[PDB]
Design a binder for this molecule. Structure first.
Ligand code: P6N
Ligand code: P6N
Ligand code: CL
Lengths: 306, 306
């Protein structure tokens, strides 16, 4: 029993992290097969970041301008191209530690593990969620760019995020591994504000199920509700609207606990209207929304990755 | 910026995790050099756990009764001995992935990363603290025994915990890597209740400093206090007594922020007497106490491990 914010084991991704240096900046790259992926703003001076023309800045860059180092051995760059907001550096050595992997573009509400790195060396691992406003609430310092987010299923690493920017409000923006930003953000130091940070309703419900599974049940009331009536309350509290698709995804957790999804919605309703009155749920004094239904089943069943 | 509950990269420890099976149970072992460490209750049936005589149970066990498997290749057990509550299985192959490592017995209040494993295969990683009552608030299911807690400094893994038991209240107990339990717990299915779960005052203060560093400052008041007067409030709320040693350890964070430790204590005082009035600090609605001062500096500076 017990419920913790749990990341995937980091080993498979650690073996892919390299250091990339272009004249000015040093950030992280991802070495898979014989290609290194990194944010394209490695070619920029902090002065350039105010309004860079990446195509023009790239004209003055050749293969040998990109210094790539795995641990303490240099890698030889034999080609380079820009794809959207990432650079793909072709090297002459395939990464011998390349795991089975896929590139995935995740949807808002989905969670993943971030391996924060500096100078191509891992510093720590933690769990995040793609916020509905397409930001992530990470922990990133200067030089952390190029760190990646991932999920592990079976023996396959699903890379879904590369870290690019920190907005003035302290939240984080980035791309998929094809270089397309999540949300409307751009790799430019400008005014780009985040939208409403709405709560991921389905994840809250999943976490409430995890609480019931792990002993915490004081919030179970005698009420039920309907999707339409619950959503009237959700809207007021800036919660994602709950759909039938969300209900169906919660089916397995509803079956395990014997609590109908709409009964759990009525408990959430009371929590939003009445607060938690100084009580706690799974060690938290607020409603947690960065656990997916899959995350809850995974941690409460003990799924393995090999 | 941003502050997250961050574990160490798990790769170095993943390479040490093996599966150990003794007739009945399968749990995890730690393969370092040519020795596999695992909980001694692997030799027990769930029936034995009510009152086992481990010495007598071990007499009927020979090297070949211990099946050790790294991934899908068997390891050959050439010797076995019991040290306190762990078994040391001598194998004929040194682990080629053995990191630089130490065994450390940590003190209450110290934090570490746990790599939860099942059948010798890693499932996830999360951060914990040794509670003042010598429990840990982990996430463990059946078969997770033998999972380990560790800290990484530089290139050296400091192993400090091996998971052994789940108490009836849902908290977790275990040993150092020399097999000595933390606190008064024993590897027996009996009545052993946990003491008061006191709050780690120094860690709360460290986290308040992390909040100031990362933008959250509403809780900074105009007051100060003294150690003796603050501790009168701490005692009332079941907080660890703060000592001069704790003050000194907070010196670096006090210097970085320009907030004297005793001024921060006065802010904590008001938080304990008046609550947070629905506000939040670093995304939490309660006072977090599983970040050490070292943890805060590490995450706010970007320390590297190679
Ligand atoms: C990716 C980097 C860019 C620079 C930076 C400065 C301060 C805090 C975070 C960051 C990043 O995320
Ligand atoms: C170490 C294992 C022993 C058995 C168990 C049953 C249920 C939940 C957790 C556990 C453990 O921690
Ligand atoms: Cl967490």
């Amino acid at each position: 029993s017990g419920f913790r914010k749990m990341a995937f084991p980091s080993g498979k991704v650690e073996g892919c992290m390299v250091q990339v240096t272009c004249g000015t900046t040093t950030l992280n790259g991802l070495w898979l097969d014989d290609v290194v992926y990194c944010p394209r703003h490695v070619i920029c001076t902090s002065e350039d970041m105010l309004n860079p023309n990446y195509e023009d800045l790239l004209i003055r860059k050749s293969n040998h301008n990109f210094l790539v180092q795995a641990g303490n051995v240099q890698l030889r760059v034999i080609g380079h191209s820009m794809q959207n907001c990432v650079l793909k550096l072709k090297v002459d050595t395939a990464n011998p530690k390349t795991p089975k992997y896929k590139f995935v573009r995740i949807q808002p509400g989905q969670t993943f593990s971030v391996l924060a790195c500096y100078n191509g060396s891992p510093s720590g691992v933690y769990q995040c969620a793609m916020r509905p406003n397409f930001t992530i609430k990470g922990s990133f310092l200067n030089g952390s760019c190029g760190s990646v987010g991932f999920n592990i299923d079976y023996d396959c690493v699903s890379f879904c995020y590369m870290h690019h920017m920190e907005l003035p409000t302290g939240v984080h923006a980035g791309t998929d591994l094809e270089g397309n930003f999540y949300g409307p953000f751009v790799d430019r130091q400008t005014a780009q504000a985040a939208g409403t940070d709405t709560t991921i309703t389905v994840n809250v419900l999943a976490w409430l199920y995890a609480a019931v599974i792990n002993g915490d049940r004081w919030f179970l009331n005698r009420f039920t509700t309907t999707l339409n009536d619950f959503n009237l309350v959700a809207m007021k509290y800036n919660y994602e609207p709950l759909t039938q698709d969300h209900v169906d995804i919660l089916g397995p957790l509803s079956a395990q606990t014997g609590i109908a999804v709409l009964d759990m919605c009525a408990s959430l309703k009371e929590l939003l209207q009445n607060g938690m009155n100084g009580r706690t749920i799974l060690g938290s004094a607020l409603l947690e929304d960065e656990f997916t239904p899959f995350d809850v089943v995974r941690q409460c069943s003990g799924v393995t990755f090999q």
